[PDB]
Design a protein around this nucleic acid. Structure first.
Ligand SMILES: [Mg+2]
Ligand SMILES: [Mg+2]
Ligand SMILES: [Mg+2]
Ligand SMILES: [Mg+2]
Ligand SMILES: [Mg+2]
Ligand SMILES: [Mg+2]
Ligand SMILES: [Mg+2]
Ligand SMILES: [Mg+2]
Ligand SMILES: [Mg+2]
Ligand SMILES: [Mg+2]
Ligand SMILES: [Mg+2]
Ligand SMILES: [Mg+2]
Ligand SMILES: [Mg+2]
Ligand SMILES: [Mg+2]
Ligand SMILES: [Mg+2]
Ligand SMILES: [Mg+2]
Ligand SMILES: [Mg+2]
Ligand SMILES: [Mg+2]
Ligand SMILES: [Mg+2]
Lengths: 45, 392, 240, 322, 117
RNA sequence: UUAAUUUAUUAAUGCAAACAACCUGCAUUAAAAAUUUCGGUUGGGGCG
RNA sequence: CCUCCGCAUAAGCCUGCGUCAGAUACUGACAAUUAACAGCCCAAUAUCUACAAUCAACCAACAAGUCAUUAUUACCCUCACUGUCAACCCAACACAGGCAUGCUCAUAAGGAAAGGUUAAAAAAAGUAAAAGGAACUCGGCAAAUCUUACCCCGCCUGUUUACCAAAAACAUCACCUCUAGCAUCACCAGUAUUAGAGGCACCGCCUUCCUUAAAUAGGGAUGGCUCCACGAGGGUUCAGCUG
RNA sequence: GCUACCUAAGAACAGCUAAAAGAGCACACCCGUCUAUGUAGCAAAAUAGUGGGAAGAUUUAUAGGUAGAGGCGACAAACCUA
RNA sequence: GCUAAACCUAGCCCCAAACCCCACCUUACUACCAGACAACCUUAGCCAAACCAUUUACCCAAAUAAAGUAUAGGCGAUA
């Protein structure tokens, strides 16, 4: 019954975790800054 | 109460920086940076000129500056105008007297069985069945498809009478023709910009139906008025317009004389379809507009009683219900409510068939109504054929 | 939330306007009013509550022809499409308003009392005392705000100086300048009380949804309680 | 999944490919008041009619030639009705669809879970001829059934995909322009208008001069095969019950100025591999080169009017059932 | 869920796949009805010379002598292109020598560069 | 919760402040809350 | 011999049983999905638009149902770009689960329940059963058959503890109580026949015996009441049926 | 991207009975009454049969919204990525 | 005798010194149309006080010393 909580959709993915949404708020900008500081290959989703 | 809430109204611009209020000093703005910064003054940008010039990025000038703008406001009737008072309003606007039923002159053209089409009912039934059931792979064709089809097939069926009537060779049904006619009514200038479709043009003008005595008898008839509804209601009040009378064709066009205007209300949705009264009003207005354009082209742009009245017919249909109109324009002196008046014979709500069953209704595994038209009325097609044959 | 009100249209029109349901939610997206949600899709017909609105470049009392009386999904009252001169507008229909009727909208406060015919609008100063009225303004030219629901009728209780006392349907007295316009008669659809919903589904169609947790305060709903005084603390819960 | 065969096509040598798909041999050749009426229709659509909105060259076909072709067909049918009684009772269709679905050849599924399995190659033509004429009595043959011709049907070694041709899965329709209940189920003449995408000017710019006649010929073959096949399948024939009489239809294809004329005789519905293994018959399409009806139109004058094109149109309209 | 693979036009739903391109430069615009109008001037016209009679070849004979690389400089170009005329006219308004005060008005403006390659 | 401590915040008033609205400060009363605690002995609990 | 399967679209995935060469649908190399289908649009400013749908014709309504165009001013070039494969996606898996839509209604499509043997026990599912027919058991659970009658609770249809509770609980029409006389972000583009909150429960009215042979079981001699209908609710019963 | 509720714009609902129904029987579809199997399972809630609803207070795809003392809740302290 | 077992530098730690072509904010890595939203606002709590409620050290701009002194503090933990 459970386990399939991920029902993928690229529209939702980009609108929820994308670069534009991350930059849309100061908190998300700090998210990107933390990922850059850590050296993440993928900064946003 | 004001319409449009503040939250939806355009936001007020932020207050100007106080630095702009100090006379002697030049504010330091981010204009030089070429991008916004929040700690510098907001520049005051001069309005940009080269913008609203490119064809794909064009802004039309204000209506006041347009070439045809006029302080006097015309009232235009176009194809998508729906008169509130309907036939009464159209009669007042066109200075017309209504006569119930088609005239005997045209009705007699189909009394003799020679004009009756061989296998007339069979062919008309096939036309109705093709339009309403057999037209497409879809089970139930929509009105947008079966109204033009029914009209065109009926016109072809009538045109088949070229055998008996060689005069039918001097006519042609043009499509997308557009006419424009302007005239005054009690200091109100009214225009009709008829677009519609299926103008049946003939090489010869239609014979007049009403005699001089009847035309003069129209003087006594009083033009019915409606209050407090102004006759202007539901007409597009426009200040941009052209007072030229356009018949829709360049000079020298063969088949110059309008014969029949085929107006069809083919909208799938009832609210997008004209009411029968409003359709009859539109027929009156378009027939009057075409007749008036013809009169202004022939006898000049002078308000006068026409020595030779101009006759224009019209058939307005929704695919099932038809309305037949013969309009005799016998005066271009429209401004006054007194004098000889134009006159229109109208036959209303002539239904070609009562209903059409695209699917066989089955109750308790028993077929009650078979597929096909029910209540077919050949009389309406007789009237249609009479209108087509008039003048031939 | 990215909520923009649907009430953005600026120009009055007769065409029904597509209205967006709210669900009881603020512009913040949080529930502000409980029990709202769903229901039949509706279109809004802009009602002109200022009955004395003379047309452009026109003035003085004017008459109007009732084109039709229609059910309004957004009101208890049924509305009337009414046309005057070269314009059409939606107004609130009175109890006996019929298609083809004639309506008078006047700003003239006659020295004598004007004969109050149901459905027409006169300044409250011109009406006889004791007349039933509806669509009452609070200020001259403000627009009708009171006595608008189906079957409601205020009473012109009194007229002294330039001030009239109206009895609102809640049986509360209201003072209004006599120059404010009101229409005579009770609002239409008088049987709105007697309508029986019959089943929960009909309310769901009307857009009312069963909703709980309507208070959001700690402990939920809590009726007011009288806090005893120190001398009275000894008698609050005397045992049997 | 079936190949969408487009009568009016941009593909090169599509006439040859359609000949293969159809089992049609193409044969070059054939098996005053009217002039005034034609000039009147031309001038009415080009000069006399007043256009409120400017006519753009990207819509010139649809706003000029389409009404022109409609007027030609309607007025000519009316005028020739005395000279052709069958034409009086005929149904004149304006842009009514013609659908034909058939199976031609086989293919081994190349990839997937169905790889290596045999699948019939299915084709669908969804045409919408500008005008068409439907009669209740079949036209006469142009040549006997089982008529052998030395010219051989082109052989295609490549998949239909190589000709730009794509597969879709949707309703399989076999339609003559009206439902089977319609008594007027046989075809007399189709009138086709090439779209602006297939302008002669654009075709000349992008291709040879032979590609214009290829476009005309491919449109003819596809459209007329579809119409005659639909007529035959309305009469009840199919691949396993082949037609006992040939089915005939004519077509004229115009770009607005240039007209070409085609006659088509369908002798086979047996197009599947099983029904075509020992099938000697083959469908036939006689065609003419595209000729300009007029050279140019200047203001109020039609310069270079060709009477022979109008005579060919009249001849098609005058063809009668026996 | 694949954060590492490059975002291309093959990935999203129909709107995404239609909207994203592959870097090809635009050739025109879209009108009503999604009809594409192609602007001729937007299409890069290849200016291909006539190679008939050309003596140079893709390769150079190894017999060619070695030389020292001397990258062209503004000073060198000025000396070899303007200095002779300047000296000849000084011994005996800089537009006469080739200088232009502004690039505006030219087809091939040097800055901001407005030509391909 | 009638356990203890508060009322910072809102809402009312009052007094000053700015000359009715609006706003600041200081009080009082509430609403809403917030923070915190659960002594010992007697199989357990009630009452002790 | 088997399948509510299959084929397509959408969404998702992203080369994931094509060829060749090495290994034991893996590795490497090579190849491939070609636009007409689909996506990617609109030159604006104004002004316009009451008249559902349901074969839309009668009849039938209430829950009242986007369909946005035209006039003037601008406008001339023309088919670019992108998706197109697969045995596939979400469930850690080559997972009996989840998975929108169009068509086929048993397939023209798609598949294989048995690695080989033997024929023990125990276990699971199924089939048949003498005579009997609930004596089983907490309980007719399950199975087989097909019926009867009555109580308690809840008016009813619905909702709920995703994953031990589907109910008598929650909701619900109906009714009652309390609060509110009013505009431009909810309530509401509403206005006391309205709105919000709480309670209650549709509605309507009045004010020792029987059952069995044995029966801790069952049924009957503002409130009080009234069970029409309904229920995988909780008890009881006739008859039948049955491992 | 689960789930709860909501917003916008969609879609589905055979056949029979009945006749405009929160109607009856019963597919698709939704659910989850009872039993059995399974219990590191096919499955971190499934399977088989049985059963309830199945034109509605229905089911459902897409996009959006409400966020932690908060949301949402036909109140089960239920649900808000096992 | 299998599985294994062993290895030494890949680098790292602490100091010192020194101040360190094209594409991409729209669905990022997307050649190419009407902007305007544009930022600033005491940390709290864990914890110690053997509960807890006032209170309970925390990049300071010279180390040491004055000095854990003066002071503060439910005058107590402590500061
Ligand atoms: Mg989902
Ligand atoms: Mg799992
Ligand atoms: Mg097996
Ligand atoms: Mg085995
Ligand atoms: Mg037995
Ligand atoms: Mg027993
Ligand atoms: Mg028994
Ligand atoms: Mg026992
Ligand atoms: Mg049982
Ligand atoms: Mg219940
Ligand atoms: Mg139930
Ligand atoms: Mg549970
Ligand atoms: Mg359960
Ligand atoms: Mg018992
Ligand atoms: Mg059904
Ligand atoms: Mg039901
Ligand atoms: Mg719920
Ligand atoms: Mg509870
Ligand atoms: Mg402590």
């Amino acid at each position: 019954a459970r386990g399939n909580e991920y029902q993928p959709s690229n529209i939702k993915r980009k609108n929820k975790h994308g670069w534009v949404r991350r930059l849309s708020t100061p908190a998300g900008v700090q998210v990107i800054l933390r990922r850059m500081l850590k050296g993440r290959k993928s900064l946003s989703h | 109460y004001e319409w449009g809430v503040r939250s939806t109204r355009k936001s007020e611009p932020p207050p100007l920086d106080r630095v702009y209020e100090i006379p002697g000093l030049e504010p330091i703005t981010f204009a030089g940076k070429m991008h916004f910064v929040p700690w510098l003054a907001r520049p005051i940008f001069p309005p940009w000129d080269r913008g609203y010039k490119d064809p794909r990025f064009y802004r039309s000038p204000p209506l006041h500056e347009h070439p045809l703008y006029k302080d006097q406001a015309c009232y235009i009737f176009h194809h998508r105008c729906r008169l509130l008072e309907g036939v009464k309003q159209a009669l007042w606007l066109t200075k017309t007297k209504l006569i119930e039923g088609l005239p005997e002159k045209v009705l007699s053209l189909v009394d003799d069985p020679r004009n009756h089409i061989e296998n007339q009912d069979e062919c008309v039934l096939n036309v109705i069945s093709h339009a309403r059931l057999w037209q497409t792979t879809e089970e139930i064709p929509k009105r947008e498809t079966y109204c033009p089809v029914i009209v065109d097939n009926l016109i072809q069926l009538c045109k088949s009478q070229i055998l008996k009537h060689p005069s039918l060779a001097r006519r042609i049904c043009v499509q997308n023709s557009t006419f424009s006619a302007t005239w005054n009514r009690e200091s109100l200038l009214l225009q009709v910009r008829g677009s519609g479709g299926a103008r049946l043009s003939t090489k010869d003008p239609l014979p007049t139906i009403a005699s001089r005595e009847e035309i003069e008898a129209t003087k006594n008839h009083v033009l019915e008025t409606f209050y407090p509804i102004s006759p202007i209601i539901d007409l597009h009040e426009c200040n941009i317009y052209d007072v030229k009378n356009d018949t829709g064709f360049q000079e020298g066009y063969p088949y110059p004389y309008p014969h029949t205007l085929y107006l069809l209300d083919k909208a799938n949705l009832r609210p997008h379809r004209l009411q029968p009264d409003q359709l009859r009003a539109k027929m009156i207005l378009f027939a009057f507009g075409s007749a008036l354009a013809q009169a202004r082209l022939l006898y000049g742009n002078d308000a006068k009683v026409l020595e030779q009245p101009v006759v224009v017919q019209s058939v307005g249909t929704d695919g099932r219900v038809f309305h037949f109109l013969v309009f005799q324009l016998n005066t271009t002196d429209l401004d006054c409510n007194e004098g000889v008046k134009n006159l229109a014979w109208v036959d209303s709500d002539q239904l070609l068939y009562q209903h059409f069953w695209c699917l066989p209704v089955i109750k308790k595994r028993v077929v009650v109504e078979p597929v096909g038209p029910v209540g077919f009325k050949p009389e309406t097609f007789r009237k249609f054929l009479a209108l087509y044959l008039h003048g031939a | 939330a990215n909520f923009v009100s649907w009430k953005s249209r600026t120009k009055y029109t007769i065409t029904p306007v597509k209205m967006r349901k709210s669900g009881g939610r603020d512009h913040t997206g949080r529930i502000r009013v409980h029990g709202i949600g769903g229901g039949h899709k509706q279109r809004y017909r802009m009602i002109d509550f200022l009955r004395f609105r003379p047309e452009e470049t026109k003035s003085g009392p004017f008459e109007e022809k009732v084109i039709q009386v229609r059910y309004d999904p957004c009101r208890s009252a049924d509305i009337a499409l009414v046309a005057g001169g070269s314009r059409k507008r939606w107004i609130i229909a009175t109890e006996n308003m019929q298609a083809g009727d004639t309506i008078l909208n006047s700003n003239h406060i006659g020295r004598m009392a004007v004969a109050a015919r149901e459905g027409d609008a006169h300044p409250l100063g011109a009406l006889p005392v004791g007349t039933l009225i509806n669509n009452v303004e609070s200020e001259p030219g403000r627009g009708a705000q009171y006595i608008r629901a189906a079957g409601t009728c205020g009473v012109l209780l009194r007229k002294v100086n330039g001030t009239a006392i109206i009895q609102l349907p809640s049986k509360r007295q209201m003072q209004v300048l006599e120059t404010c316009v009101a229409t005579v008669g009770r609002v239409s659809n008088v049987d709105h009380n007697k309508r029986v919903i019959g089943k929960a589904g009909r309310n769901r169609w009307l857009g009312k949804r069963p909703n709980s947790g309507r208070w959001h305060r700690k402990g939920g709903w809590a009726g007011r309680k009288i806090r005893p005084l120190p001398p009275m603390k000894s008698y609050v819960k005397l045992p049997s | 999944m079936k190949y969408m065969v487009y009568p009016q096509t941009f593909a090169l040598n599509a006439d040859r490919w359609y000949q293969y798909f159809t089992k049609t041999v193409f044969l070059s050749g054939l098996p005053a008041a009217l002039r005034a009426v034609a000039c009147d229709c031309l001038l009415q659509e080009h000069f006399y009619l007043r256009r409120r909105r400017r006519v753009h060259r990207y819509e010139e076909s649809e706003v000029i030639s389409l009404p022109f072709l409609d007027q030609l067909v309607s007025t000519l049918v009316g005028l020739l009705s005395p000279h052709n009684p069958a034409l009086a009772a005929a149904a004149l269709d304006y842009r009514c669809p013609v659908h034909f679905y058939w199976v031609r050849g086989e293919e081994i599924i190349p990839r997937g879970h169905r790889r290596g399995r045999i699948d019939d190659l299915r084709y669908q033509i969804d045409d919408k001829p500008n005008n068409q004429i439907r009669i209740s009595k079949q036209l006469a043959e142009f040549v006997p059934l089982d008529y052998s011709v030395p010219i051989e049907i082109p052989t295609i070694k490549c998949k239909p995909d190589k000709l730009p041709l794509f597969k879709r899965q949707y309703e399989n329709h076999i339609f003559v322009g009206s439902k089977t209940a319609d008594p007027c189920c046989y075809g007399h003449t189709q009138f086709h208008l090439l779209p602006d995408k297939l302008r002669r000017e654009r075709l000349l710019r992008q291709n040879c001069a032979d590609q214009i006649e290829v476009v005309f010929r491919a449109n003819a073959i596809a459209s007329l095969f579809a119409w005659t096949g639909a007529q035959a399948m309305y009469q009840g024939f199919w691949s396993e019950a082949d037609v006992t009489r040939p089915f005939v239809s004519q077509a004229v294809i115009t770009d607005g100025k240039y007209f070409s004329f085609f006659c088509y005789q369908l002798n086979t519905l047996a197009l599947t591999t099983q029904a075509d293994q020992n099938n000697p018959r083959k469908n036939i399409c006689w065609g003419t080169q595209s000729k300009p009806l007029y050279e140019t139109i200047e203001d109020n004058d039609v310069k270079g009017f060709n009477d022979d094109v109008l005579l060919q149109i009249v001849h098609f309209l005058l063809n009668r059932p026996k | 869920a694949d954060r590492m693979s490059k975002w291309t036009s093959k990935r999203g739903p129909r709107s995404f796949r239609g909207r994203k391109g592959r870097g090809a430069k635009g050739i025109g615009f879209l009108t009503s009805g999604w009809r594409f109008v192609q602007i001729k001037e937007m299409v890069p016209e290849f200016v291909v010379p006539d190679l008939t009679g050309f003596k140079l070849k893709p390769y150079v004979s190894y017999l060619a002598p070695e030389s020292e690389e001397t990258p062209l400089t503004a000073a060198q170009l000025f000396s070899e292109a303007v200095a002779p005329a300047i000296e000849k006219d000084f011994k005996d308004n800089l537009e006469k020598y080739g200088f232009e005060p502004t690039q505006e008005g030219k087809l091939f403006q040097l800055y901001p560069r407005n030509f391909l390659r």
